[PDB]
Amino acid sequence: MTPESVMMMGTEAMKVALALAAPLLLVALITGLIISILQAATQINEMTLSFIPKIVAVFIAIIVAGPWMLNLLLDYVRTLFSNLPYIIG
Amino acid sequence: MTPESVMMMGTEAMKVALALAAPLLLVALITGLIISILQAATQINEMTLSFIPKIVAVFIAIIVAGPWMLNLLLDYVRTLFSNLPYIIG
Amino acid sequence: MTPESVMMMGTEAMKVALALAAPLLLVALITGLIISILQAATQINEMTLSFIPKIVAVFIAIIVAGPWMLNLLLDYVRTLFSNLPYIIG
Amino acid sequence: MTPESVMMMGTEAMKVALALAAPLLLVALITGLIISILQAATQINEMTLSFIPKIVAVFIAIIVAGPWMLNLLLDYVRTLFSNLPYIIG
Amino acid sequence: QTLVFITSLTFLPAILLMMTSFTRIIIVFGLLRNALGTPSAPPNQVLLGLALFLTFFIMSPVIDKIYVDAYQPFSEQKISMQEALDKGAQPLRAFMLRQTREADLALFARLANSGPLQGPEAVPMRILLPAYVTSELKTAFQIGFTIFIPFLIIDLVIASVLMALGMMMVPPATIALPFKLMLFVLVDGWQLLVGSLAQSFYS
Amino acid sequence: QTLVFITSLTFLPAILLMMTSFTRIIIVFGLLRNALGTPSAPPNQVLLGLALFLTFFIMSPVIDKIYVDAYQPFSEQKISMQEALDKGAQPLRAFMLRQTREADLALFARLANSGPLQGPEAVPMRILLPAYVTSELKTAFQIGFTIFIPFLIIDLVIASVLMALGMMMVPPATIALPFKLMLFVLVDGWQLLVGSLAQSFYS
Amino acid sequence: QTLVFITSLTFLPAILLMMTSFTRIIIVFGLLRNALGTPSAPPNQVLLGLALFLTFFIMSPVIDKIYVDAYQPFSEQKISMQEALDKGAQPLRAFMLRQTREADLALFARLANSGPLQGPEAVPMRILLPAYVTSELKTAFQIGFTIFIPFLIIDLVIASVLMALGMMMVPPATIALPFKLMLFVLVDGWQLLVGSLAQSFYS
Amino acid sequence: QTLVFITSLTFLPAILLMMTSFTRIIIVFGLLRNALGTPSAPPNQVLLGLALFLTFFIMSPVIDKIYVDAYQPFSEQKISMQEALDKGAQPLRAFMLRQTREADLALFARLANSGPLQGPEAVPMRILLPAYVTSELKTAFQIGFTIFIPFLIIDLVIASVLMALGMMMVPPATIALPFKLMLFVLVDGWQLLVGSLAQSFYS
Amino acid sequence: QTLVFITSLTFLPAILLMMTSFTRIIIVFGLLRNALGTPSAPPNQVLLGLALFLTFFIMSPVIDKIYVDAYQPFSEQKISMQEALDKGAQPLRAFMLRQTREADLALFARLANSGPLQGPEAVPMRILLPAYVTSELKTAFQIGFTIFIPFLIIDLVIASVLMALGMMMVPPATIALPFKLMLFVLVDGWQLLVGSLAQSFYS
Amino acid sequence: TSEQWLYWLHLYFWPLLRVLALISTAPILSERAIPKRVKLGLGIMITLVIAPSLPANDTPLFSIAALWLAMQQILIGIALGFTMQFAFAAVRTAGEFIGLQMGLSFATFVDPGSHLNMPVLARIMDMLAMLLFLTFNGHLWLISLLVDTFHTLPIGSNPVNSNAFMALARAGGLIFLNGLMLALPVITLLLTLNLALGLLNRMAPQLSIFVIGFPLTLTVGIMLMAALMPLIAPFCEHLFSEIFNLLADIVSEMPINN
């Protein structure tokens, strides 16, 4: 319970959150840019034309990533629940 | 409750959702693209001009799809609720 | 209770909705299209130039149509809420 | 509560709202056309070139019209809130 | 008999505030703040306080009548719920029959398969309360619908003006809060409301 | 017996309130105010009171039977054990059987693994209640589903119109509430609802 | 008392709060936080603590007069709950009457139909409160509209400078969010608000 | 003595209901109401009653055994609960042991460091109750997670259809409350739930 | 005497449950329920029963020592509780003194202006209790806040993913709840939780 | 058990009310996660330590005049509670305005249902900054401060003053100041991204911030929020010291002006 431990808690939390969320968001941005380039250059653009592929991409990437995105949480929540009696002491 | 069984339930639900959602947004994207390609070559391009066809298309597609899109849910929810007493142990 | 009667309900409601909202967006689309054609051949176009007639058109069409649109709903909601005590059985 | 009185109320409110918003969007459209036409005859256009005049024109027209645009609302709102105890009975 | 006694207490104020008034007032206030964007008023304190003061004043004549009829001989506590029900109800009954649509009672007498219906007491207590509340709700929703119109006017004006300039992405629902506020304080729009809910009430 | 008295004051009201009616009604109002956007009624005060009154009118024959056949003879205080509970349940049995789906009693006779059950009075208490409740909740969800449809029509219509002009910015749930009140006071939508919940109930 | 006592005690804290102030303050704080996007303050704690501290400061002289003229003399001699209540009502009355609009008194004297009144303090206690609350609501919405103005100007200039260059799609709701805070603290805004709500109260 | 008496009066009505059932059922229903949008069915009234009735139906055999083995000798009052609680504990002991996980017994024995366990009644009660409740919670959350999936399918397919054609602003929690009532009376899901919770319970 | 008697109905049992345990376990479970979305577990029965069962487990050796040392001669009722208290307070005290942090003891010994103590047993009970309870609060929060973080991370990830697609108007709290159930039952999360809370307690 | 002693038990009720006031108004330190009979248990325990050694001998006369005295205590308790919570409101406000700049802020429109933006970030920064109190002392400093107010501002005729309530009411004030001071680097970095996405629109208007913007800025707003965690550790030390100085100063100022 030293203010180094309390800040290490947060520094681990945000790193796990980034590791989880960054693949999905990066696929979303990649699909967005790939279609937005095709959006111009043959100028045609209504408004979206791209939210549908931005759903296809996430729906694919979640199944492809799958297991280890689970394993991260499984490991870290377990270590948390195991170290709880030593955080106090 | 291994993360393999939960992965099986997940892959089943995602296939059901794909089956439910494919025709609606597929037709949406198709008609949107077909109109947008007309926005050039006769450059006329107001803002959308195509939110209405995307409405009539879904209006047609839900009528045509109709019974089996509901039968999918009716069957899968039935098997789910019948297998519930066998997921506990 | 069978998926057949619920499909009858759907065929009724969607047709009421179409009849209710047809003229509004029809005249909207028509004025918008005829203007956006004029925005070519004398290409002049800043961005919109056309939202104003889309307001005037719907403004006229609501006033013209008016009572019969309301009578539709007053009739069909009446039939619904009057058949209500028999949908039970 | 006849569907006729609830058409009279709408027919009054629509015309009051039109009376309010008339000069604003009228001068908006006027200035828009006037500028966009001069996007020929030394045609060169960057993107818009026409937002600022649309702002100064509305800024002029608001203070020009002003008090009577306020008076319309101030009168008919008083009328509505004074006639409330009669629409009930 | 301790069972029924305390069971009656947890509801009795709530039902008492149903028998008389304060229903349509609170419903109008609730539908008021639904316009003007956010709540913007702390219902815990202001709206309930106003609704209590207004109903107190509106009921003051019939409340003082009930006082004279019951509470003055109740100095002795004459009879436990025999004529305090009658000399409490006849005022209540006239108060609601002045306010109740004659057709609502027709419906609630049809379903009850009624026979002789001549006096207010020939319309039993169990028949009035639901019909009374149904009528009150209809009146309150009438008032509430009439309220919304100028705010719709303002919102549509602002939205159309923004979309006219080429302001495609500004949230006009957030610009139009001070304008509603000013155009509602200018017209002295809070005197009119608590005056209409007091005039249209008794009639 | 001091224990069972407070446990009774805790549970027994909720039991008697589920045992007769007032379960099908409240779910309907609760699903109703889920439409119309905001609460639009203070459930702590209005909807609960109204739903209690409707039931106090609907169960008039059952409550009259109970009174005349239990408590008028209970002035004698003959027996508070056998005919206080047994005789009092005879009207409730019929009132619950008349509104109980047939498939439900089959299921809860099957699970309990009973032998020959012919008499509905030979149907013990414990098989009756949960089947009755499941049936009631089914029918209440049916009515609640049938309710929502015109409101959905209005909201989809307004949203489509708004998107047609390009008004992405506007939160269409704010324009569609006054129309949701107009279409609800215009067809007298409030009389029909209580009429339906009163007619279809007993049957 | 058994029943009325506890209910009256529960109602009391709303009565004392509404009677005096704190119904004009919280509305201004709410409107402030409604400017600058989301709440940006935990209502149930902070914007109640601050809004109670200001009110007690503003009302300290009233309580000082009440103390000096009622408690100290009612102590040990010379007053028995009759002159104390009077000489304590008169300062609070003079406090309210200074704030009520002139019309609201006339309105609530007309609808309540009070006879010939001669003294301002002679206006009964019941007639004072609701007119006071309505007047303060008007003044509070006025202050809130005066507050909203510079933030509107900021948003308008930023949106314009965006569209002056060609930023049609970019939702200026984000860019203009830090500038509000920067220019609300860079000019030490909060002190100006307590200053205004302290000066413009009695004037 | 009377002190611990009212002490137990405050707790025991919860201790008993925890001991048998009513801890998986309520939690499953509560995880249900969180699906289907808004808390439609009111927890203060309906779910408590439904869950208590269903638990009475399931516990009827255990209650019969407890009756014939305790109350019938409690008619005589053979001994002061010395075996009425004792013999009454046997059916509850075996009942819990049937559904009690075997790993939870192991863990909670390890935390207490108990030696060889051979017989069922070699399991001390203070090892059962916590392990029992944690097992019931595991089961309840398993059932609750399994219930959700179709509602998630509906919500996400609706939300992904809306944003497919503009309409980014319609709050899909309004279009998806009906569908969750078509799907839920169309498949008769109110019979499948109670059937499964009654069946899987005994095992 | 309705006041003085009835306040001690909850006072004394709550104080008796403040002495030893049941003060931190409630808080851990309540923080869990503050996470994990809505209540989803009714406090009125479930959490109270669970947190009382775990305390009857953890304090089993303590109650055993009391039962042998003081309860058993109290069957004789040899002395009014003087050593019954003492020889029962010493197991309670020794259990308490093991968990009271150091700072709290020194602080509350200062605030009482006490004299220098030679033995820990010399620490009076009126000094121990508040220090113990404060220490227990500040460790219960240290566990609870360390439990949240994964749940809040799931919330943040879900919200970011939803907003990445364009689904502004969805309440991501409704899509979170199932994932926060699978990641609770999937890591056996309840057994870890209770084993921790039962180990870290005594150690 | 007769009413003989209950009136002697009536001696502790005033400090009891003060301490219950200080407890009830500082929830994030002692909040609704606690059962109201434990949150009230602390009171009667603590006063038993404090009640003796106080020369407090007062009387609730007929139609009690000391009801007016009940006005005094609730103020001082509130004066401590509703003051101490500015150390949390500052970090909550620093957290909110960050998330509102990436994706959370589309509750800008008319009032939606629940907030749904608070639970993202401002519920974590309030949690960390709630653990940092418990490492130094949560209520210990506060309970000592209130023990001191039991000596300075005891009980009685001259209840309170003014011009100090105005002091701590003009005080925050510093809520928004500290709110900036924390998040200034994150906000400055994110403004540059928000304007950088802009200069793409002038190159191609199809980049539609819903297509590019949020998937880009969300990852960066998580990155920077990870990289700026340690800076929260020495900063919170100020937010505690400044406000404790505030409290001590005003609590010492009030009585000498009586």
Residue numbers in the entry:
A (entry chain G), B (entry chain H), C (entry chain I), D (entry chain J): 1 to 89
E (entry chain D), F (entry chain C), G (entry chain E), H (entry chain B), I (entry chain A): 43 to 245
J (entry chain F): 5 to 262
Q: Could you pull the original sentences from the published paper?
A:
We have recently demonstrated that a subset of these proteins assembles into a core export gate complex and reported the structure of a flagellar FliP5Q4R1 complex (here termed FliPQR) at 4.2 Å by cryo-electron microscopy (cryo-EM). Strikingly, placement of the FliPQR structure into lower-resolution basal body structures revealed that this complex, built from three putative membrane proteins and purified from membranes when expressed in isolation of the rest of the T3SS, physiologically exists in an extramembrane location at the core of the basal body. This positioning of the complex, in conjunction with the observation that it exhibits helical symmetry, suggested that it seeds assembly of the axial helical components that culminate in the flagellum or needle. Re-refinement of the original Salmonella enterica serovar Typhimurium (S. Typhimurium) flagellar FliPQR data using RELION-3 (19) yielded a significant improvement in the resolution of the density, as estimated from both Fourier shell correlation (FSC) curves and the level of detail visible in the volume. We have remodeled and re-refined the coordinates into the new volume, and although there are no substantial differences, the level of confidence in these coordinates as accurately representing the biological object is clearly increased.
